[model samples]
Target: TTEIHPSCVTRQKVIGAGEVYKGMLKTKEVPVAIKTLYTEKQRVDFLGEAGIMGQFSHHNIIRLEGVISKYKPMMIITEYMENGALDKFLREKDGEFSVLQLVGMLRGIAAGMKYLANMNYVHRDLAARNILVNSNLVCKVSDFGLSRVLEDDKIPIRWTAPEAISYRKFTSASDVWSFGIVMWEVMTYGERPYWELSNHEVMKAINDGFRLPTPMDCPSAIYQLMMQCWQQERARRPKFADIVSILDKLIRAPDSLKTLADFDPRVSIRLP
Candidate 1:
């Protein structure tokens, strides 16, 4: 129920295709992450994001404060996540976290999914890229690349479930399939999913019952959790509630995580 003027947006930096800023709105001393639209096609899609995002209400979900469509290069404002995206944050702090610390970060992500899954809100595209990490180690769900139509070669093939790809079925079940990949990514400290595999290859491998290999030193319990998420029957996958419980148990019973799953050479396409 609010309108924002172009003057309200004060871009601090221009990054790549679009610029995100650490600025204030309406003269308020609040740090905002402003996503601006510079193209005509982006205009319709970007503003539509404002409506869909503003209705979401959860602590772990990124908060859409307001929109600035009354002027050119209209912007959608969200609370700034100082630490940036989860994948980048993990890569920057490479191997700096112990299993417990990593598990806690994962738990935070699952906690957010708990809220979304409860509402039957399927995150069409779920990956470490869209998960925002804050200074406090809090991870909130952000954009899943849905702002624009698939006009270019945008691929998140590795995170997708085989069924989702084959039939274009999107649901919490499909999202869980992607979560398994996220588990592997976090364990590998943000390694690319199916390293060196082309998108077409990655798609074929999953269809052939080839799951991602266990990351070296990944706890057995978490690896087992990852397997559960990858069950072929989407109905067989664990819900976000169960995922939160599994993480909580591991956090409480640290001894259970001491056993690392051994990586099998035969299971991986390329041996390293």
Candidate 2:
């Protein structure tokens, strides 16, 4: 319902295929990330992104300040995250956060996802890279741009559920699967999920019932919940609402996060 004037915003250096920018909103004199569509064709996507991003107002969800549609190089101004993507931050600051602190961040993500899930929206991409980290170390679900076709392929196959990979049937349930990947990523201090496994290979292995190994120092309770998220049957995956409550209970009882989860390589190697 609001818009920013063109002159009021200044685009900084580019990021992510020239679609995103680190910039400033003059009126507020605050830093912001700008989303610019390269052509009129992609402008419609900004419209679509803004429509959903703007409407879903949750603290854990990134805020869309405003848009500059009437002008060339239209922009979607959003609050700037000081620490950049969550995965990189965790990778760079590995072992800096306490186990309990890590759950706080993860819980922030789940709470936001819970809101989106209740709204019945599917976060086609829900990995840690898409989650931003601010100076306060809080997690916020970032905006979307259709997954960027990484490796020139856009399916987010590593984080994708087997059913979604096989049929393109995305849902909150599928997002839950990706959230499991997020748990693995964060607990491992931002290690890449599956470490260089090709998309088809990941799909095949997940289809064969091979789940990710528990990350070092990841709590038993956390890994158990992550395993639940990877359930083959979508119905078996816990709802985001349940996910939030479970984390809350775990956090309240910090002793539950002290024990590490186990992983056995040969056990995971079994074939169907």
Candidate 3:
């Protein structure tokens, strides 16, 4: 295990439930994000996270540098994202990025998810909030506290797949479902998912065939892709690799994007 000297680490702002800091190692100072856990159970969870992320070596996936698990207040150290979470970053930038730029970010996320799928890992908490952005505008998937090895468990209600919510079964398919919500978040520049619906209301709406309406100004092609990800049948949902290919095609053919036409602001919900 790589040892981290507390004296060399300077704590910064709080991110989620943890604190992030800048650390100095050798001649260079590297920014690092840290997640702290107090109890034995939380420690186990953190170790599990480390084990999963430590094995990942993808550009779009956050890199796990090291962990300080032998001491109190166990810590998981990862590469710091200069721009922080994707949702907040997009919200702050507002309309600064074109639709194509946004699609580029989505493409990076899809690529990362595809890698995870190939590795047989299921990120149960895949969402915009869990995505981090660097200064280069590169988006990387983060937050693996809820990730598992192709297993099943309870997950976030709004972003979770229907079968996951009903039967507690999680797979790469469920991750795709959450990716659709992430797309919605990105398209809307960080709008809340499900449009202020409660957990119960969201479940009922999904049961009633209610899907989130396209964001204002969202492209029809992208919205159609989101709908495909929200397919009720897990088997019908597009795989992450397929999603990557589609996004790549969209990036290559800009003229094809016009098919969806810009959304009408007056329409809030698209009823099924």
The candidate maximizing TM-score is: 2
Instruction: Give the C-alpha miss distance for residue 175 in model 1, angstroms.
Output: 0.4
Better of 1 and 3 by lDDT: 3
Predicted candidate 3 versus true structure: per-residue lDDT over 199-246, tens digit per residue: 889889999988887787778889989999999988889999999999
The local lDDT score (0 to 100) that residue 113 gets in candidate 3 is 96
Best by lDDT: 2
Runs with alpha carbons beyond 4 Å of true place in candidate 1? 5-8, 26-28, 38-41, 144-153, 266-272
lDDT, residue 198, candidate 2: 86
As a whole number from 0 to 100, the lDDT of residue 177 in candidate 3 is 95
lDDT of each: 0.80, 0.84, 0.82
Q: For model 2, how does the per-residue alpha-carbon lDDT over 91-118 read when each residue is reduced to its tens digit?
A: 8998898999899899999999999999
Whole-model lDDT, model 1: 0.80
Q: Can you write out model 1's per-residue Cα lDDT over 1-272, one digit (the tens) per residue?
A: 25777676676754324667777766436778888764666666677677767767887888888887777667788888988888998899998889998888888888888888887778867889888988887888888345522112343677887777777777888888888888888888999888899888877887788888888899999999999999999888998889999999999999989999987676565555
| Model 3 misplacement above 4 A | 1-8, 12-18, 70-73, 146-154, 262-272
The Cα error of candidate 3 at residue 143, in Å, is 0.3
Per-candidate count of clashing residue pairs (backbone under 3 Å) = 0, 1, 1
Which is superior by lDDT, 2 or 3?
2
